[PDB]
Symmetry: D2
Subunit: 293 residues, 4 copies
């Protein structure tokens, strides 16, 4: 079962921008400790697009060693290249992941038929692991229609869709057309509204520091406690407001650093460092979250 | 009281010659009232106001007032590209006894934010006391405002509400967070339930004309913490919206209302075309379903 | 000329302090344009602030311009409104006043289907009673993004004799010319006039022609004679001016310059358009001086 | 002449074999083919070279081979851009080692980088280019990065920047850029508006279609220089008839197919996810190849 609240894992680096293995292991354990349902590895949040294939594989392997069998593991193996995506998919299979995922190939304009074959090829290489189609027009530049999304999610081997779109009319339409589809809400800031529209779970970057709040919104809605659902979403958004200002990945890494999880809060260039003017708020947030749970 | 609630964006019934069909207009107003609607938003996109003359828009306002003033809330959309024309309609809305005025951000020409602000100020002045409902509808106006700009507009002297026709529910929540007492109408019918959850405390929509009770049902369900009921009602509304988008929204609605014996002739004004005959069977069945459901 | 090809100024509508039409200034502006050697005038479009004018006000302007320039220069009446019926009324008036052609921007705000757009133009053409139609493509303001195939269909509708192309896509400009060798094709963005002509346009309609139309005529001539350098220098000068007008606000900036040239009495635009920022007056006054001396 | 970057330069394609591996023989043939048709230089490792579906070592291999074939004969610009600054720096250092005349980098994409981050990205690559001029690459349609004129002005005035490849159809901006930077080497990026782009201010161009008909673009440069507008328009029109076709067939694969028919490329395949050319287009592509060979 792939339904649930899963954190989009960050990739800790050292001062020289190389993978910080110890911090990666610590972050995985930190997520498991807070009760996350699983981890989405190698996606935007893992800074996969500023990493080489071997580096992405290294992360996948380490995460599997740390969490396989404890929580669900989804490997984002997407690359612009189909061959590269297939290589990562085969590795994900070898490491024991529960599923693979791929963002619609970007930069170059590809036809819908080319997108479909891309997924089929990756699904083939995943050798049994279900595919999680990844729709994120804001970053990919690929704007799929409802009909195209319907076609992609019905491809043999596809078991879920990570929907990083704020269009909740489309979210409802997808649920209506696919009653049993695992549908992850992608934008943390509309989690509550996304679940109401039809999503049955979610994958997000901020889950790394406050995943319990999202689990709290799932519970609240399940119990009909709209008031609690809204309060939690509001608090999540006050945090997201900040992270968008500071830079999301580096902001999250900085909070995790103050929580003593990540040794060095750096992102790889061209991502710049956090503006020191935000440190007071990030430190205060880390303190608040540590007390909260 | 206040301006919070579920308000139908009123359609303007026309006769075979595209002239205002007063009799049908009156029937539609009473039809909405009987559905339990909290009020009416008159003279906006749905009333085909932008293909009407000022005199025609005033006529519709006056008649609606005659029919519903004192029974339900009445919001007059007096927006035009021209500030002066908007002001004329604002003055008339006051004269007819409306509860508030509203204006879409002036379109076509690219206006600076300062110009938009002065535009609203001028209309509020002519509204002579009636509160202003700012109207944000980027998809149709082409005006894309930032959160900061929206915050500035809703805090202008005389503004009492915002009709938010935007699918960005992060921004909906941000608006609610920054303005806890603001009357916030969800504009897109298809995300009503989620819009309320995000922070909207009511809504204004075109489809309320034929199934307003469903939207009232969503408000009640969420109020009682009945998530499943809210979702089921929204799903049903969306099945209808799916159809209306295919047939053309205004003409599809008028056609359903015709089959409900509310409107005599279901046509819209040119350039709007007639409904494709292949959709009539579905629209008739819908009309029957809604009537039996209600 | 027995055709509609040429350089036509998009006429501004002079208003008095009360925002009411300044007839005297309108007449002076029409005569000023004729004296500049303009080939014609495009009346009642964006530049005439038609969309913040009532139907009768737009008609009044059409009547006055006709009185002033009918038979002297070509006259194109932009009768476009969102409403088809309203557009038809202006088309009938344009015909009665003796205009050479009518024009209509793709109806905006509401999302109309392409078939609805086609019927819209057909209806207006009918009311134009013989006057050729100039389809007006201006996606930036209208929000209507037509495909090449849709544009081809529109320009070939019975009664259509030209296209005002306010688009910076010069690949599409060339494709239109390639598909329609004899089509009258007006370049809409003044800032790329020279390149637009090179791509296939055989004329142009623009707001800045009101204060320096001879420069655009000079560009046409320069290209006709193979004088690339002159065409570029002229376009560069026009763009230095356009840079300023975009900062000051185009219509009010143009009107202010015209006021300094003693053409327009009150350089005001109708609300929501605001007044020019006084900090720009020195540059606008200097520009007016430069243009007058340049003549 | 020794260091002048102005001119008409082809965006080089990367020939692959049936297994999607680099076809060295065809790559060398393509470089020679371009030199033979009088091209001023080559832009290597950009969008057209399918660099974004190639590894760093594969991109370096192409750079090295092209240098062996053309260094000293024509100008060589190495597009070393990657989303990653570090990878871009590696390619920049290799470009210098191989003897390229300049480096170039597309604005990093996918992630929404701030303008300051873009600036530091270019500065870092410029440092690694150690002397080779940088060609800023603005291509919003593919990168999704929409820069303002002020931002472009800031980028092209960074120390070490000697040119800008402007893949934008906004010819007002093209003129503004030329007006603000009279000495800036400015390459028109969209082949379909080459003539108008030069008229607006560009002093040269870089394009994918130059691989099969570069002499036409050189013809347009000459035509405009001589004040022969009719000839310039005629050539642009013929180029656009071809571009109309390539957009329908798929640009890179359509070009490779024509080059295959011209006996330059052994296998006209692009790397997945790019699909093969639809056979219904072969008649026009073969006829085009024949026409171009007749013309050349």
């Amino acid at each position: 079962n792939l339904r649930g609240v899963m954190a989009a894992l960050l990739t800790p680096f050292d001062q020289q921008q190389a993978l910080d293995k110890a911090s990666l292991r610590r972050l995985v354990q930190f997520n498991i400790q807070q009760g996350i349902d699983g981890l989405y590895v190698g996606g935007s949040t893992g800074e996969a697009f500023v990493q080489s294939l071997s580096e992405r594989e290294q992360v996948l392997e380490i995460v599997a060693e740390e969490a396989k069998g404890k929580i669900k593991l989804i490997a984002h193996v997407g690359c612009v290249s189909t061959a590269e995506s297939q290589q990562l998919a085969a590795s994900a299979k070898r490491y024991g992941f529960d599923a693979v995922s791929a963002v619609t190939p970007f930069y170059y304009p590809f036809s819908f038929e080319e997108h479909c074959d891309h997924y089929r090829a990756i699904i083939d290489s995943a050798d049994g692991l279900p595919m999680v189609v990844y729709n994120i027009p804001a970053l990919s530049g690929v704007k799929l229609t409802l009909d195209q999304i319907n076609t992609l999610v019905t491809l043999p081997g596809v078991g879920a869709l990570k929907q990083t779109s704020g269009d909740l009319y489309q979210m409802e339409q997808i649920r209506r057309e696919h009653p049993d589809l695992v549908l992850y809400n992608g934008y943390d800031e509309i989690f509550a509204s996304g679940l109401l529209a039809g999503a049955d779970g979610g994958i997000g970057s901020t889950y790394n520091i406050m995943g319990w709040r999202y689990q709290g919104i799932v519970k609240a809605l399940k119990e009909g406690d709209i008031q609690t659902a809204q309060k939690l979403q509001t608090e999540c958004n006050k945090v997201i407001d900040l992270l968008i200002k500071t830079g999301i990945f580096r902001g999250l890494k900085t909070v995790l650093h103050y929580m003593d999880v990540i040794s060095v809060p750096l992102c790889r260039k061209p991502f710049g460092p956090v503006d020191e003017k935000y440190l007071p708020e990030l430190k205060a947030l880390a303190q608040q979250l540590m007390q909260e749970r």
